[PDB]
């Protein structure tokens, strides 16, 4: 049903199947019935869920939901305490509001990660014609294309796009552009003749988006709407399931860890609180406070800030991301599936090789001409160059003198454009030179003569001869020659020269290149006077016994920076696969040229030819390289595709369909690969969507390709992929640094509540000041770890195992929580007891002191000296407690950020001051702390107190202890890599 | 195996127990040195006691402050007020006051040696006698029965705080909004002028003066109208007492609602 088989049906069979007439069309009535049966001939737009539902689910998620529940508990508390007329507990309203702001701001961060929010079927329906000409009841007229139905009889002419998928009945000189299917814009002939098994390859099927470049044809509408081949390409592009990026996986993972541990601590201490005498409402408030303390309210925000600071860096290299997650993925990539035409190559036919003087020469095919040229001293060469210059009909359009020769626009077919650019580049000015030798006679290329010819006055004032120049298919050019230019002389063409020619010609064929022969003849004045009347239809000139000059061959060459980029990715442990719709021989030649196939790699057919032994008997694992075509691939089983991918590290998939590209990508994925896809064409969009990351070419890319992509290369510099690999590996290694620093301080946020509950000391740390730490004083330091340089030689490392190397694993967690976080909590408590005692409250009096502390009916409570304190006085002293715990945590966070600068190296080698953003971050942290402490008013707005310098210093021994402890740990892992000390205390 | 091998679990566990004992010990030693730095007689800092709080007896709280309401006819409505007054005064008996001495200096009682028993400084007696009409005798209803009740105004003690020696610090009670209906609140204070004798100062702390008792002053409210809600403010007048704090209504003054139902 989906599959077109109508290319294999007689006209009788098609007329019966569709109920139509191959000359007069469908009846109007039956066309209307069919239109009501199948709907418009149009692509159905699959709309993604509304713009607000995106934001709604950005407001859920584990941390988000814990914050929700916490704000709900604050609102219930604020309601209950306002209902009994208690005005002091407005903190719960301020707290629920802050939490709600954090939820909403976090969800904004998660929503504005996706910049574009565009649809792909918009760009697909821009490839669709609006009108068609149809024959119904023998009346030919023009309708809207969406009114066409399966069975209609339709006319196409050169210039217009094909209105549906069509089985062709009549055609005159008709040629189409099938780049939306193959990525190749080479014109294809359409006839009514069935020339292939595949409807994708036969000449008598034409497709819906495609342009008819020339000629005229008539045919039966065989598929419409999403059933057309462009409709199915668009279905695959649009309808691929929302799969999460590697870093979303990592983020969701640590969110699950943290939400679980939060629910654990809240629930167990709520149980404990009720066991220990508190009332339900009070234990519920403890659960809210423990969730606020333990959860990192600022974390998701810091992560998307780090992702942004990497997106900025990439963007400065003309590498534009469409969503912050795509900033990581290339760093975790293990297989790259790459389009060839216009992705690895320039999509521009270029002169590549030359046969003359019995040797094959190589031309410089780079777009900058940054490469290796060939030898131009020969006089055979001067003659061949004269021939290929004078026998061209193309021309540069005017005023391009500033444009580089490869970019310049030429009026001519592909080959003549290539020859013209090669002329302009090799000798001075192709058109000026050309005008110096005036054409007196010419026949353009026919399918009858099978060559192109022109006869020319010479430039020399003295020389009165006429030079004839001719080009065409090599064997055809040869069978009209009798001599050949070899090393400054003209030899008769004996059998050995014909053999050498044929060998060279088939060699250049084997490199996937198109070959042209070029010949000459000088016509004397004694037979052709200076004004001889050269008339084409008379053929008064010879056209035989010509002098052969050389072969010139051409290919779509690699973009200059592509081959080194590919070896670089391979050095980073990334596999590179070619996935092209082009023909296999060209595919393999470009694969070899660009480094996808290494010097010395052999396919199974390669080995078979080397040993003159059948393919049957070649041992499959002896072949490092492999070239599978789309037909072969259609024939394989999934297991067979897997065994191929496992058996041959250097893999080329040629002549593949859009769906087949997606199938290769997903086969890699199912084997555990994180896959990137680099392309430029409509035929790449399905593989682009399905890839863990899709990179489109910015200049050469078609709109479907760019829309489906997650990254765009604005200057088409494939080397940018290598930049991306490095930044992704960097941002991952630095995010784990950033995150470890942010989680650490959650434990000394938590423990003061756990002690306050179970020990009933006056409350050491309030929820407002926790938020101030989480959302303000520690944020810039954690972000500054983004700018940390690489510790090791990251671009000679293998891609990370996605299943074993995670952003946050239990070593990082347990170290950050239950070692360093614990040291910080001990600091906080040491400072708390110091400030209490120095203000009159000995440690043992604090145990159980909480109820009298928090009693508004108790204005003369006695302290360890007997001094009498009001509730107000005690409350300010509580705020002093908050502040001294806050400063202990800040001071410890200075050491924290310093030791998170390096997971392996010592800070004595890299130094403390190399990262200057981090130093600015520390200074900003301390400044905003001083502001909070010593700006007047702060005691009655945010509960911060001008603490004494002693309590700034009290926690500093603990901070230094953190530095030293981590410094020694990392020494240990360096000196003892096999050790227990490595295997357990590395993170 | 359960996450790890059992041997690896034991080794990790002992490392964390070691880590935590070492850290707990470092902490304990911090607290120990802290308590050797701390002097047992004078606190290191008095950052939150720049001005003394003031409290009242009998302290009955409505919501958002002291609220006191009783009926002159039903003696059961003031029974508890007189009872907590009696029970507060229990520690100001001449027996309870045996640990203190008779001061007459009418001047700051500065002592820098410990001449009192068990290495102590002397502290001045304050006996309920000194409250006269508001002492529980001869009127054991503390003025409530007659609708002219006694409220006892105590000042929070602070180590080495001196209130000012040009005179004694006094109490002054008055109305918050002096009612256009009526005259100013008329008070008789015991002792006379509602003063705290200077020799009750400075306080040297619970270890130096274990038998210290805060001097009191009873305000006998004579003017209060019946069946009307009034608000009474009592401030301490001294050179070094402030009562302007908006975040502490009990700093240097005490306010309370009063209603004497008839
Ligand atoms: C995961 C497992 C975690 C395990 C956590 C364990 C935490 C426990 C660690 C230590 C326990 C307390 C150590 C106290 C050592 C006392 C040393 C000492 O001899 O000092 C004397 C004081 C008594 O004063 P004095 O009568 O002599 O004063 C008179 C003043 N003069 C001397 C001038 C006359 O002894 C005293 O205070 C006795 C009362 C001590 C105060 C109890 C305070 C309770 C607070 C606990 C919070 C701990 C948080 C830990 C955070 C862990 C993070 C994971
Ligand atoms: C299923 C999950 C695990 C659950 C663990 C439960 C652990 C054991 C729980 C309880 C056992 C102890 C029970 C004590 C006897 C009942 C106490 C009681 O009836 O109440 C009395 C007071 C609280 O009332 P009040 O006298 O102040 O009120 C008076 C009102 N007024 C102020 C006006 C006078 O009790 C006090 O304050 C003094 C008592 C202090 C005892 C602290 C014990 C520490 C408790 C738990 C820590 C264990 C955590 C384990 C974490 C494992 C996680 C994996
Ligand atoms: C996730 C990683 C974080 C790890 C943190 C987890 C936290 C879980 C810890 C749980 C430990 C709970 C310990 C419970 C202790 C209760 C002590 C107690 O209820 O004891 C009573 C006396 C206090 O004096 P009092 O009752 O006469 O004052 C009352 C004056 N009134 C009667 C006029 C009101 O305690 C004494 O004498 C001396 C008793 C010494 C208490 C030291 C407590 C330090 C313990 C652990 C830290
Ligand atoms: C592995 C190697 C790294 C660790 C070794 C380095 C730490 C020792 C080195 C230097 C310590 C002092 C550094 C300067 C900062 C002072 C911290 C502090 O002064 O802390 C002392 C607190 C009690 O403060 P305070 O009343 O003496 O203040 C005095 C206020 N004034 C003098 C103005 C009246 O008690 C305490 O932390 C505990 C004091 C006893 C010493 C144990 C330190 C444990 C820390 C770890
Ligand atoms: C590996 C390294 C690990 C080690 C970590 C080292 C971290 C170093 C960070 C640098 C810290 C800088 O510290 C600056 C601290 O400034 C404290 C200022 O102290 C002033 C003390 O004042 C006492 C407060 O008195 C309160 C009463 O004020 C009355 C007078 O007010 C006048 C106006 O002042 C306003 C409040 O002071
Ligand atoms: C110090 C005393 C009171 C607490 C002793 C409780 C024990 C059972 C606790 C305290 C610290 C805990 C460990 C903290 C760190 C880690 C490493 C992590 O990758 C797995 C969990 C694990 C291994 C925890 C297991 C349980 C643990 C060992
Ligand atoms: C300490 O002195 C007090 C005086 O306040 C006395 O009552 C007590 O008996 C003495 N205690 C001892 C142990 O001598
Ligand atoms: C206090 O007692 C004396 C003696 O009874 C009396 O004269 C005086 O009026 C009393 N004061 C008040 C306010 O009743
Ligand atoms: C008040 O105290 C001061 C202390 O500064 C003292 O010198 C002075 O003599 C005292 N004056 C009176 C009148 O008590
Ligand atoms: C305080 O008492 C004295 C007598 O010692 C008297 O002169 C003065 O007027 C009294 N002040 C007030 C306000 O009653
Ligand atoms: C005071 O008590 C009497 C007698 O019990 C009662 O009649 C009167 O209403 C009470 N006062 C008020 C204000 O209710
Ligand atoms: Mg392409
Ligand atoms: Rb937190
Ligand atoms: Rb062209
Ligand atoms: Rb000429
Ligand atoms: Rb393209
Ligand atoms: Rb994708
Ligand atoms: Rb995908």
Overview of this protein structure:
The complex is a heterodimer of chains A (about 1000) and B (about 260). Chain A has about 1000 residues and is of the alpha+beta class. Chain A folds into 4 domains: about 1-40 and about 120-240, Distorted Sandwich (Calcium-transporting ATPase, cytoplasmic transduction domain A), CATH 2.70.150.10; about 55-110 and about 240-335 and about 720-985, Calcium-transporting ATPase, transmembrane domain (Up-down Bundle), CATH 1.20.1110.10; about 335-345 and about 560-720, Rossmann fold, CATH 3.40.50.1000; about 345-555, Calcium-transporting ATPase, cytoplasmic domain N, CATH 3.40.1110. In chain A, about 45% of the residues lie in helices and about 15% in strands. In chain A, a hairpin with a 2-residue loop joins strand 1 and strand 2 (about 140-145). Chain A starts with 10 loop residues before the first helix and ends with a helix. Chain B is an alpha+beta fold and about 260 residues long. Chain B has one domain. Chain B is about 20% helix and about 20% strand. Chain B has 2 helices and 8 strands. A 4-stranded antiparallel sheet of chain B has the order 1-3-6-5. Chain B has a 4-stranded mixed sheet with strand order 2-8-7-4. The longest helix of chain B has about 30 residues, at about 5-35. At the A-B interface, helix 30, strand 28 and helix 33 of A face helix 1 of B. Chain B: Belongs to the X(+)/potassium ATPases subunit beta family. Chain B: This is Potassium-transporting ATPase subunit beta. Chain B: GO terms for molecular function: ATPase activator activity. Chain B: It is found in: Apical cell membrane; Cell membrane. Chain B: It holds the Pfam family Na_K-ATPase.
């Amino acid at each position: 049903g989906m599959e077109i088989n109508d290319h294999q049906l007689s006209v009788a069979e098609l007329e019966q199947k569709y109920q139509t007439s191959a000359t007069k069309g469908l009846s109007a009535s039956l066309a209307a019935e069919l239109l009501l049966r199948d709907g418009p001939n149009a692509l159905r737009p699959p709309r993604g869920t509304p713009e607000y539902v995106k934001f709604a689910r950005q407001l859920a998620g584990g941390l988000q939901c814990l914050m929700w529940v916490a704000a709900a508990i604050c609102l219930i508390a604020f309601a209950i305490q306002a209902s009994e007329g208690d005005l002091t507990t407005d903190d719960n309203l301020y707290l629920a509001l802050a939490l709600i702001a954090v939820v909403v701001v976090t969800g904004c961060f998660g929503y504005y990660q996706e910049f574009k929010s565009t649809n792909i079927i918009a760009s697909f329906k821009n490839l669709v014609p609006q009108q068609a000409t149809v024959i119904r009841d023998g009346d030919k007229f023009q309708i809207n294309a969406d009114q066409l139905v399966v069975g209609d009889l339709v006319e196409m002419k050169g210039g217009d796009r094909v209105p549906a998928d069509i089985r062709i009945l009549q055609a005159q000189g008709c040629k189409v552009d099938n780049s939306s299917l193959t990525g190749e814009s080479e014109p294809q002939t359409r006839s009514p003749e069935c020339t292939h098994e595949s409807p994708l390859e036969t000449r008598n099927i034409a497709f819906f988006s495609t342009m008819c470049l020339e000629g005229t044809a008539q045919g039966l509408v065989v598929n419409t709407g999403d059933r057309t081949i462009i409709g199915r390409i668009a279905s695959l592009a649009s309808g691929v399931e929302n799969e999460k990026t590697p870093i979303a996986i990592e983020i969701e993972h640590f969110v699950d860890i943290i939400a679980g541990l939060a629910i654990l601590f809240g629930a167990t201490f709520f149980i404990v609180a009720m066991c220990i005498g508190y009332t339900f409402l009070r234990a519920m408030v403890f659960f809210m406070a423990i969730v606020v303390a333990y959860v990192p309210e600022g974390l998701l925000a810091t992560v998307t800030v780090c992702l942004s600071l990497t997106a900025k860096r990439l963007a400065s290299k003309n590498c534009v991301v469409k969503n912050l997650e795509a900033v990581e993925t290339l760093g975790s990539t293990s297989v790259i599936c790459s389009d060839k035409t216009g992705t690895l190559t320039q999509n521009r036919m270029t002169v590549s090789h030359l046969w003359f003087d019995n040797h094959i020469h190589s031309a410089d095919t780079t777009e900058d001409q940054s490469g290796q040229t060939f030898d131009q001293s020969s006089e055979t060469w001067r003659a061949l160059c004269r021939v290929l210059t004078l026998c061209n009909r193309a021309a540069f359009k005017s005023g391009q003198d500033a444009v580089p020769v490869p970019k310049r626009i030429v009026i001519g077919d592909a080959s003549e454009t290539a020859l013209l650019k090669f002329s302009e580049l090799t000798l001075g000015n192709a058109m000026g030179y050309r005008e110096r030798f005036p054409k007196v006679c010419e026949i353009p290329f026919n399918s009858t003569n099978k060559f192109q010819l022109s006869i020319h006055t010479l430039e020399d004032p003295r020389d009165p001869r006429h030079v004839l120049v001719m080009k065409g298919a090599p064997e055809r050019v040869l069978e009209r020659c009798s001599s050949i230019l070899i090393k400054g002389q003209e030899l008769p063409l004996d059998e050995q020269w014909r053999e050498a020619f044929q060998t060279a010609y088939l060699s250049l064929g084997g490199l996937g290149e198109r070959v042209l022969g070029f010949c000459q003849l000088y016509l004397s004045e004694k037979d052709y006077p200076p004004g001889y009347a050269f008339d084409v239809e008379a053929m008064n000139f010879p056209t035989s016994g010509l002098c052969f000059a050389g072969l010139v061959s051409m290919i779509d060459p690699p973009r200059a920076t592509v081959p080194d980029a590919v070896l670089k990715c391979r050095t980073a442990g990334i596999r590179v696969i070619m996935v092209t719709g082009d023909h296999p021989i060209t595919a393999k030649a470009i694969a070899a040229s660009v480094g996808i196939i290494s010097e010395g790699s052999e396919t199974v057919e390669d080995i078979a030819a080397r040993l003159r032994v059948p393919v049957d008997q070649v041992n499959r694992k002896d072949a490092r390289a492999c070239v599978i075509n789309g037909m072969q691939l259609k024939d394989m089983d999934p297991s067979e595709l897997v065994e191929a991918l496992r058996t041959h590290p250097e893999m080329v998939f040629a002549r593949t369909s859009p769906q087949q590209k997606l199938v290769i990508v997903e086969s890699c994925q199912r084997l555990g690969a994180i896959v990137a896809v680099t392309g430029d064409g409509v035929n790449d969009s399905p593989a682009l969507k399905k890839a863990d990351i899709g990179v489109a070419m910015g200049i050469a890319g078609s709109d479907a390709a760019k829309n489906a992509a997650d990254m765009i290369l604005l200057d088409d510099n494939f080397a940018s992929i290598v930049t991306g690999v490095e930044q992704g590996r960097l941002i991952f290694d630095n995010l784990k640094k950033s995150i470890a620093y942010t989680l650490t301080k959650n434990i000394p946020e938590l423990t003061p509540w756990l002690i306050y509950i179970t020990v009933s000391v006056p409350l050491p740390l309030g929820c407002i000041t926790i938020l101030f730490i989480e959302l303000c004083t520690d944020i810039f330091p954690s972000v500054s770890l983004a700018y940390e340089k690489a510790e090791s030689d990251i671009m000679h490392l293998r891609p990370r195992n996605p299943k074993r190397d995670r952003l946050v694993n239990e070593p990082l967690a347990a170290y950050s929580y239950f070692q360093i976080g614990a040291i910080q909590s001990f600091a906080g408590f040491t400072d708390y007891f110091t400030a209490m005692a120095q203000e009159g409250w000995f440690p043992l009096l604090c145990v159980g002191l909480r109820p009298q502390w928090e009693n508004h009916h108790l204005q003369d409570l006695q302290d360890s000296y007997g001094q009498e304190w009001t509730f107000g006085q005690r409350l300010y002293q509580q705020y002093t407690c908050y502040t001294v715990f806050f400063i202990s945590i800040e001071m410890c966070q200075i050491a924290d950020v310093l030791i998170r600068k390096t997971r392996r190296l010592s800070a004595f080698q890299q130094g403390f001051f190399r990262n200057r953003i981090l130093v600015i971050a520390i200074v900003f942290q301390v400044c905003i702390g001083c502001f909070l402490c010593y700006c007047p008013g702060m005691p009655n707005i945010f509960n911060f107190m001008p603490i004494r310098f002693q309590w700034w210093l009290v926690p500093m021994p603990f901070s230094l202890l953190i530095f030293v402890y981590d410094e020694i740990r990392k020494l240990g892992v360096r000196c003892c890599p096999g050790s227990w000390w490595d295997q357990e205390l590395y993170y | 195996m359960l996450g790890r091998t059992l041997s690896r679990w034991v080794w990790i566990s002992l490392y964390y127990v070691a880590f935590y004992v070492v850290m707990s010990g470092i902490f304990a030693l911090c607290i120990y040195v802290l308590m050797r730095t701390i002097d047992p007689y004078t606190p290191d800092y008095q950052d939150q006691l720049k001005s003394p709080g003031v409290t009242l007896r009998p302290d009955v709280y409505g919501e958002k402050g002291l609220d006191i309401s009783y009926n002159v006819s039903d003696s059961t409505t003031w029974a508890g007020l007189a009872h907590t007054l009696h029970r507060f005064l229990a520690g100001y008996s001449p027996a309870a006051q045996e640990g203190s001495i008779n001061c007459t200096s009418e001047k700051y009682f500065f002592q820098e040696s410990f001449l009192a028993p068990n290495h102590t400084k002397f502290s001045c007696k304050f006996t309920a006698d000194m409250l006269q009409n508001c002492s529980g005798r001869p009127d054991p209803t503390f003025g409530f029965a007659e609708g002219k009740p006694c409220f006892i105004i105590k000042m929070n003690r602070i180590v080495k705080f001196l209130p000012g020696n040009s005179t004694a610090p006094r109490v002054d009670c008055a109305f918050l909004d002096q009612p256009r209906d009526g005259p100013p609140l008329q008070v008789e204070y015991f002792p006379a002028n509602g003063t705290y004798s200077l020799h009750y100062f400075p306080y040297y702390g619970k270890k130096a003066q274990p038998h210290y008792s805060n001097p009191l002053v009873a305000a006998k409210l004579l003017n209060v109208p019946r069946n009307r809600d009034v608000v009474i403010v009592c401030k301490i007048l001294a050179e070094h007492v402030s009562f302007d704090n908006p975040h502490d209504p009990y700093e240097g003054k005490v306010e309370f609602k009063l209603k004497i139902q008839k």
